[PDB]
């Protein structure tokens, strides 16, 4: 009873998943809080797997304990970036690597 | 001064016996475990191997003389007994920096474990653990790029990476070959690999596959949005063929070639380490042989020591065993050596086999590998294991799925950020792995496939490696 | 044809274990002395080895079924269990000539020892020997010269070759290094060499050596009116390293260099081999690290089967142990590997440890070379054991001569030369070594001062690497 | 308070500031006379910052000494290549390198 | 300028490293221009000739930022350039805020001169004026407002 697996563009981490409820979400971003992550929301016009930059919303979160403050951004990135991929990012600074990165929105159509 | 030659022999514990000797933190430390002949005792044992080691040879030579011996020979400063263990003991003995040449694990190797192995006066010697002074250290290149400059290359952040090795081992022509790569990466696989008996064939030669396999990434790479690899294997019989395929490799544009250290050797693989820093490729790894040298805890050198000369000869990724797949791996011990290749400083804790603190100076880590009869029922084991920073590859479990390679990866890939979701979110993947893995095979038929396919497959023998 | 896919984990057996398969004579035999953990049967732990190291992985891929398994996989075509040990059986493997990249050692160990000694199935498992086939033995160099031109090269005819090591191992500058080759060369010994762990480090550099023992070699030549040789030691970091050095004893015009096959690794010695052979300087390999992996008999690869891969990579010179010296060798199984890397048909003899008649199509044999705790007393039974084809090393009964280097350089070289004269005569150097000895120390009171000084010294231990 | 930068494309100097009034132009056009370079317009369907090359309007105006003949010709060229970029350079001809550079009209649209 | 290079740093005079505004305006008229006259009131103590040999671009960078860009302009003129390290990434919005808000300072100088105010007697009005309408630029004007590197210089001609 075997399917053919459909073409389907995905965007890394969570992709492979159905798409997360805000308080799934939340739940993300909480653990970032925990871990001590820095959150950081990006934007990209596009989802090249090639580029390496996305553009930086603001400033990373650096003081930042509080779940809602994130989403909050997340929510006016996406206001003014509605046509853009939107995708939160977690920052380890004693690593230096982003340890966290998952897109919270895709760009309309 | 030194003064007056005798010639004939003398006992090692009178020059390399020094129990009084307190290592300079620019020594090398090594701890052997060792039984020796009966008549020989423990602490001339250890001399004997301090000497053989070093300096020193079976008579008196004259030639000491014209040297300071005191500041070249190897000092066994320390002998205990295994606890338990009959006519066992650990000795650790201390090397002057001087002794190795700068940047050669070759040489380091040909010194500590070159000769003292046959020894007639031994019965059986195991190699535990080197400490690589910081000041050597500092001489070697090591990974040429590293856990987080590897993330930072590929857009990987987030999760354990996942590979594939194709199968079967040998038979499949260059096209099958990359059609079976296609099919693995669009299915949600970061990697593909050469299986490392995949040199060049008369059934399947080298610049054939290359060429099917980076049309294979390039289609699944634009299907999918995701950077894919395929550790292309360039080992070989002679480093300049070794150099040509990894060139080739450069030449496709290819992220990642892949190299057999232990049956290549550490020479071969230090050239190759030096060449992919030059030359943006990362370097996986393979670890062929080392079970030849590493299972038995009673003689021969623990992978432990292995995946330290690795690390500093150069490697991106390393196959670190499973634990709880087909081959051997301590778990208590495995956790050990992960730390040794993957941080920057570890402290000294025999409970997981480190014998030594460790520190690399900012020497970056190496990826862990898990690969060898693993499936999606272990995949909350492995996360909580290994966690983000690993590489987690089955290549049995994804071709061996009921539907094929592309099913067989969408498989792994859900099940794996399943996991990884529960656990960010505080699901203890121990207690409740199976359950997040059939929630997951509710929404993911391809995983309910999977999942039913391999319920009853399980490795669980006695492990021989015991601490 | 290939007909039907079914996903799942079977039984090895069913598609490895062959017992009705008769080898072809391109087939690679391989013979594994193996301990199956309980519970597991000795067909299904024989065939996971022949699948492992084949084709075959834990679960069924459908990609199997693109190609042509039954001509592809390994077939562990016989099983018998050890005489007398409990739980112990040799498995006999045999492996297509398409499964091998030509010429290359490097993926002929990835496939046969890669993975199969991890097995969590497998308690302990040794590779006892490897049937190489004549069509696969044609696509190696081997011997970059040979027994025979070797001779003819240095003009040395009628005896065992006569050698030193240089001590102390490490410590000595270059200028001393010299110092002590001149001695000894000048004293009567054909070759003097640099021990396996003098690379280049800070009290000496390599070329800064390369430079004094070329100075040696000619002073104690011109002197002696003999070829002398003194084997530099090439091993090196890396691939680039290793051939500046190889370069530089060229343009010095040195016959002989040396390298650590083991340690440095095979892909870099079959450079050198290439290399040697193509700019005439003879290649001794030395064999250090052999010991982690050759010397118990339940796990790990029998020398036997590294001395016939070196034979293929490259070498004029291996180590091959004493028998009677201070390292461990049994004479029945070094009696056996003498004949393999020495001969061109080796018929099969068990009480040899020679599992396999070998066939070398007329590629040269490589002289054996005993080194290690080995003085005057012994040179009886060493002419006896090895015949004229081979090379006697004394360092530390060089070195450690009352007098020095150069009365105890003759008096080996009288010491031998007594004993090759007595053996042509039709003496029994058996029976009548001492007395040979003491005769010649009659006459050279050189010679009677080292059996003066050697006379109680023994190495006399049970040998762990029992047949 | 901060503000994420917006992206829009520019065209070199003067580009940061808001645009020029006709009689902004006149004042940067005097400034050449008074410098003593030479006036050209030069105009191009596109603005690739690559290029090196856009298209010349007539020939240089050496013999200047008035703004206004400068603005007429860009008049002129505004009517016959109003689909087009249209930039006034001034030219130093003892040091023979271009010392002025703005555009003066984009494309229609 | 002999051994090569297209760009050296300069000094900047007004910022956090000493530079001789005398002797500054000396040497950037020696490594950009073909014919110096000796002058040792600038510490050119001999007539340079380069024998049309390419001049090298004056690089002004150490502990600048907007409110100096009217001094700057002045003194090293077009054939410059100017460099703000901590002027820009010390911006309150960041990098590219930063970035605008230098450019915005430096367009408005430039234009300011072109159309010939005074950058000496103007410079903080039309820095002002250009705040006025560009919001990252204000916040820096604000930032930046007191920050200021005056001291004895060692090097006096
Ligand atoms: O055949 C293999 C895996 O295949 P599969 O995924 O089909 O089991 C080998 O590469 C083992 O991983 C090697 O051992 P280590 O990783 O223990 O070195
Ligand atoms: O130190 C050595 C000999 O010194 P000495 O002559 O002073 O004993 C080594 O080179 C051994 O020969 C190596 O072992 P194998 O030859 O058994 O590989
Ligand atoms: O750190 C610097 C500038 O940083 P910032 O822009 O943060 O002040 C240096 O490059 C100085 O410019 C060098 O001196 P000179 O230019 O005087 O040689």
Same mark, same amino acid.
């Given at each position: 009873?075997?399917? !053919?697996?459909? $073409?389907?563009?995905? *965007?890394?981490?969570? +992709?492979?998943?159905?798409? &997360? ?33 996305? !553009?930086?919303? $603001?400033?990373?979160? *650096?003081?930042?304990? +509080?779940?809602?403050?994130? &989403? ?38 | ?467």
């Amino acid at each position: 009873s075997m399917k !053919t697996l459909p $073409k389907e563009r995905r *965007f890394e981490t969570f +992709s492979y998943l159905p798409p &997360l409820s805000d308080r799934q979400i939340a739940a993300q971003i909480e653990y970032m809080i925990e871990q001590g992550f820095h959150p950081l929301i990006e934007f990209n016009e596009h989802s090249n797997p090639e580029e390496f930059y996305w !553009t930086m919303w $603001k400033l990373p979160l *650096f003081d930042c304990k +509080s779940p809602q403050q994130v &989403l909050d951004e997340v929510r006016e990135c996406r206001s003014e970036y509605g046509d853009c991929y939107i995708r939160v990012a977690g920052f380890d600074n004693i690593k230096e690597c982003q340890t966290v990165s998952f897109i919270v929105h895709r760009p309309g159509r | 001064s030194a003064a007056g030659y005798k010639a004939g022999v003398k006992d090692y514990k009178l020059t390399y016996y020094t129990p009084d000797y307190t290592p300079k933190d620019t020594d090398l430390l090594a701890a052997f475990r060792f039984s020796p002949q009966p008549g020989v005792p423990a602490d001339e044992a250890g001399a004997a191997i301090a000497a053989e080691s070093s300096t020193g040879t079976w008579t008196t030579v004259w030639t000491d003389l014209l040297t300071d011996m005191d500041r070249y020979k190897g000092k066994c400063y320390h002998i205990e007994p295994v606890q338990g263990e009959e006519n066992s003991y650990f000795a650790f003995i201390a090397y002057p920096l001087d002794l190795f040449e700068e940047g050669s694990v070759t040489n380091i190797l040909t010194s500590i474990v070159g000769n003292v192995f046959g020894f007639k006066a031994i019965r059986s010697l195991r190699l535990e653990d080197i400490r690589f002074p910081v000041a050597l250290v500092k001489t070697f290149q090591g990974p040429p790029h590293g856990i987080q400059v590897e993330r930072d290359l590929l857009n990987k952040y987030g999760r354990p990476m996942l590979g594939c090795t194709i199968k079967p081992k040998l038979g499949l022509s260059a096209k099958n070959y990359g059609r079976a790569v296609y099919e693995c990466l669009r299915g949600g696989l970061d990697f593909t690999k050469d299986d490392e008996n995949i040199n060049s064939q008369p059934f399947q030669r080298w610049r054939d596959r290359f060429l099917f396999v980076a049309d294979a990434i390039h289609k699944s790479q634009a299907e999918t949005g995701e950077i894919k690899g395929h550790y292309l294997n360039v080992t070989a019989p002679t480093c300049e063929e070794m150099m040509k395929r990894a060139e080739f490799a450069k030449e496709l544009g290819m992220p990642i070639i892949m190299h057999d250290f232990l049956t290549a050797g550490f020479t071969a693989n230090t050239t190759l380490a030096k060449w992919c820093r030059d030359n943006g490729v990362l370097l996986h790894i393979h670890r062929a042989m080392h079970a030849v040298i590493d299972r038995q805890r009673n003689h021969g050198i623990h992978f432990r020591v292995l995946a330290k000369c690795l690390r500093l000869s150069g490697g991106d990724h390393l196959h670190s065993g499973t634990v709880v797949g087909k081959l051997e791996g301590d778990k208590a011990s495995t956790l050990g050596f992960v730390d040794l290749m993957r941080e920057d400083h570890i402290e000294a804790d025999r409970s997981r086999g480190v014998f030594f603190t460790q520190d690399w100076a900012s020497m970056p880590g190496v990826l862990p590998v898990a690969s060898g009869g693993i499936h999606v029922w272990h995949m909350p084991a492995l996360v909580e294991i290994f966690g983000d920073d690993s590489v987690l590859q089955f290549g049995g479990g994804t071709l061996g799925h009921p539907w094929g390679n592309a099913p067989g990866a969408t498989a792994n890939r859900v099940a794996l950020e399943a996991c990884v979701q529960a656990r960010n979110e505080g699901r203890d993947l121990y207690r409740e792995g199976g359950d997040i893995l059939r929630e997951a095979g509710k929404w993911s038929p391809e995983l309910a496939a999977a999942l039913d396919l391999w319920k009853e497959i399980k490795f669980e023998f006695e492990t021989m490696d015991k601490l």
